Amino acid sequence: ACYCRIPACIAGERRYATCIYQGRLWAFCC
Ligand SMILES: [Cl-]
Ligand SMILES: [Cl-]
For residue 2, the ligand closest to its alpha carbon is 1
Listed in order, strand segments (DSSP E) in 1-30 are 3-5, 15-21, 24-29
For residue 4, the ligand closest to its alpha carbon is 2
The alpha carbon of 27 and the centre of ligand 2 are apart by a number of angstroms equal to 5
The alpha carbon of 1 and the centre of ligand 2 are apart by a number of angstroms equal to 18
Domain boundaries, the chain: 1-30
Q: Which amino acid is at 12?
A: G
CA dihedral of residues 11, 16, 20, 21 (deg, nearest 10): -50
Task: Say which experimental method was used.
Answer: X-ray
For residue 13, the ligand closest to its alpha carbon is 1
Contacts of 18 (CB under 8 A, 6+ apart): 25, 26, 27, 28
For residue 9, the ligand closest to its alpha carbon is 2
